[PDB]
Design a protein around this ligand. Structure first.
Ligand SMILES: Cc1cc(-c2noc(=O)[nH]2)ccc1-c1cc(=O)c(O)c(C(=O)O)[nH]1
Ligand SMILES: [Mn+2]
Ligand SMILES: [Mn+2]
Length: 176
């Protein structure tokens, strides 16, 4: 699979390994579910990028479940903020709120409703597309123009890379 080769070549090994771990532990093979693998990596990278543009953010996504919940509990105990039912992706120490990060091959409003419906919580939601569109709750985009622009550019580059290798048509039809 070119798709597996693309993944190993466009994401850095820590991300690839983190994505592989999370698939394999749940009995999913990244050489078979190659679109899912590419999606997990993409989303991981966005979460890491989002975190890196701030010690403003706590990274929750990408840790094992014990650690993610340890981090969430520890944030809750010290800030007082409500404990989410689902593991979010980051915590924002400036805005004092969790963030759910969405990356979608579909329209941002569509994916946004899917997320908000799933955590109907007082978690902030920020959706990115592979087209440069974003949507965030209350149109509050958390980051500055430049950090958002780097995320959008990276996502658009992944898409175009996939398109170079004729993987994009498959990739975008494999989301809900
Ligand atoms: C990135 C991803 C991909 C899939 C997926 N399954 O088949 C695919 O093509 N993608 C399912 C869930 C998730 C996912 C998305 C999120 O935004 C997210 O916060 C999580 C999470 O588990 O915390 N998982
Ligand atoms: Mn997550
Ligand atoms: Mn997410």
């Amino acid at each position: 699979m070119a798709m597996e080769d693309f993944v190993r070549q466009c994401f850095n090994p820590m991300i690839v390994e983190l994505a592989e771990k999370a698939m394999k532990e749940y009995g999913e093979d990244p050489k078979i579910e190659t679109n899912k693998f590419a999606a997990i990596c993409t989303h991981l990278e966005v979460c890491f990028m989002y975190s890196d543009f701030g010690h403003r953010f706590e990274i929750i996504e990408g840790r094992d479940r014990i650690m993610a919940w340890t981090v969430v509990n520890s944030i809750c105990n010290t800030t007082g903020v409500e404990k989410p039912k689902f593991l979010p992706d980051l915590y924002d120490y400036k805005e004092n709120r969790f963030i759910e990060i969405g990356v979608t091959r579909r329209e941002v409003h569509i994916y946004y409703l899917e997320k908000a419906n799933k955590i109907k919580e007082k978690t902030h939601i920020h959706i990115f597309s592979f087209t440069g569109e974003e949507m965030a709750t209350k149109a509050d985009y958390t980051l500055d123009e430049e950090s958002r622009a780097r995320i959008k550019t990276r996502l658009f580059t992944i898409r175009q890379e996939m398109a170079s290798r004729s993987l994009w048509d498959s990739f975008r039809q494999s989301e809900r």
